[PDB]
């Protein structure tokens, strides 16, 4: 019935997107309850243990907190730094609060981006977590405080909200708990990234959403077969992450494998000689925006 | 920062989506000042020109049409159709309605898909509107009634609602007027779809989005060039539009081009070299995202 790259509907963040200005920097932030969650940065540009002693004496009405979309301007009655956030306690309680959960995001995952600027949402797009802890999304100055999140069952699930952009177009942030994903920190410093590593799980998605729509025998899809053992020892020298990463998504791509009636040995095969050659499907594989169960709950089983 | 497929946020379609039951056909509706769309067959599964004497001998109370969101049922109080949508005037006037127009979607275009169930938005996934007048979309049963807009400063501007599911994978409905996409109608019945054509705008804005993503120079690209006259010769055979298919996108193109210092003529001139659904870019959303 089609396959795409589905994204949470935006309309439960939207009317919980404030804007917060301190001093002279401005960004965005969350308003849950009686609570607004923005990056910690916004009441200055310091480093290491120096967080503590500026929140202590943080101005707490010198926080600018407006929603936008419900036109009402909010006052901070305290300020409670919770890792690389800020937790500032409003006197208003947001009426628009839905279900929601501070749930981490596992890399390999996918979410959807409520890419704000003063305090509305404007973009909307999806990105995967990497195994580099990073995302490659698209942000301007003022965008902090965009938050990532998905949606299950009248539930909201929240896992990201924006900090840093590395130069090589990767993104960087914490949770709504406030707890960087990987070892970067929100300070103006160098940072090294870890080595890029294939999501295998997500590649191996790709490649069967091909092999869905395509309709052609595609010329890459090799007619042999390699094992996982046989893969997972090739993927150690090859910038690939142990087959499967999640005993979740075996689910998803057995069901795939099946659907197709390509097994998924023929994929990995393809993924060891389709390092050669392919990678953008542009005229005449190898990629994590599609993942398993993305593929698999758009497929006709 | 980075090129990404660009969405439009969907929160005041979310407030406006309602749900639309009639006999045993459900689907989904958009609710606007006090009347409400969605698709006429909603009353039964007719064709051709009967359907004016089965909207006139449709009851205004058999409708069934709640919004979720707001937890509200309404009830319908007149009934009319225009085009193959019907409009339902409910008493309650919507509070949530935005500033609204109902704007003609051309082809190639791209628009944000809401696709909605029992008046619920469940998922959002971006379509660009096809030359034979189709989208490679994802609809499920009970998807009827799902929008597909846009945004701009303050006013949303409705393009779409879903009709019809194709044999190949591609879907089709009407504007928010009750006019169809193309010679297709809301029937049960193998359709003749037109033939399809390459929208060269949005194919010299794929390879313009690899360049600013990736390297300055990649192994696909073409050293020589081609130029529009001598490529449109080579597309009236090679199932590719006339280029430029829309103008306005040329101002997008000749930025995109100096911004890579690679010229269109070049593009195009790779186009016809690389010739021997995913992520569809559009001129405009590619220099959008461009710097400088
Ligand atoms: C927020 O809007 C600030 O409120 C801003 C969002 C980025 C700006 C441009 N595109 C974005 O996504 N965040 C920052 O500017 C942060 C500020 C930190 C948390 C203190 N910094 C970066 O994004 C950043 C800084 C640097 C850098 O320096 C030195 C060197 C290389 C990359 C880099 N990214
Ligand atoms: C709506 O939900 C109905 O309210 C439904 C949406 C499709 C269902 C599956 N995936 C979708 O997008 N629309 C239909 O079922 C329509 C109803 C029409 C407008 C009366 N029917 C089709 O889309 C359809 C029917 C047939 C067919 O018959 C016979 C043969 C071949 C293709 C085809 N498409």
Not at 163 to 182: A, C, P, Q, R, V
Request: with cysteine; hydrophobic share 40%; proline share 4%.
């Amino acid at each position: 019935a089609g396959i795409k790259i589905l994204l949470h509907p935006s309309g439960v963040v939207e009317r919980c997107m404030v804007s917060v200005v301190y001093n002279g920097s401005a960004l965005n932030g969350i308003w849950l309850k009686n609570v607004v969650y923005c990056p910690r940065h916004v009441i200055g540009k310091f480093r290491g243990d120096q967080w503590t002693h500026m929140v202590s004496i943080a101005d707490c009405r010198d926080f600018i907190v407006k929603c936008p979309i419900q036109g009402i301007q909010l006052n901070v009655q305290s300020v409670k730094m919770v890792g690389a956030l800020l937790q500032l306690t409003v006197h208003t309680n947001n009426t628009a609060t839905p279900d929601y959960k501070f749930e981490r995001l596992q890399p390999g995952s996918s979410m959807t981006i409520a890419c704000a600027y003063d305090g509305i949402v404007r973009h909307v797009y999806h990105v995967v977590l990497q195994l580099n802890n990073l995302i490659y999304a698209s942000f301007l100055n003022g965008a902090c405080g965009s938050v990532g999140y998905t949606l299950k069952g009248k539930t909201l699930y929240l896992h990201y909200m924006h900090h840093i952009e590395f130069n090589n177009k990767t993104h960087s942030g914490t949770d709504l708990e406030g707890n960087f994903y990987g070892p970067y920190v929100d300070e103006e410093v160098i940072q090294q990234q870890t080595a890029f590593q294939y999501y295998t799980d997500n590649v191996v998605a790709q490649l069967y959403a091909h092999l869905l729509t395509v309709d052609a025998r595609p010329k890459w899809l090799a007619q042999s077969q390699i094992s996982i053992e046989d893969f997972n020892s090739w993927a150690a020298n090859n910038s690939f992450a142990n087959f499967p990463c999640e005993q979740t998504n075996m689910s998803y791509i057995m069901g795939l494998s099946q659907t197709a009636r390509v097994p998924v040995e023929r994929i990995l095969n393809t993924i060891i000689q389709l390092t050669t050659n392919r990678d953008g499907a542009c005229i005449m594989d190898f990629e994590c925006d599609w993942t398993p169960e993305m593929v698999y709950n758009q497929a006709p089983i």
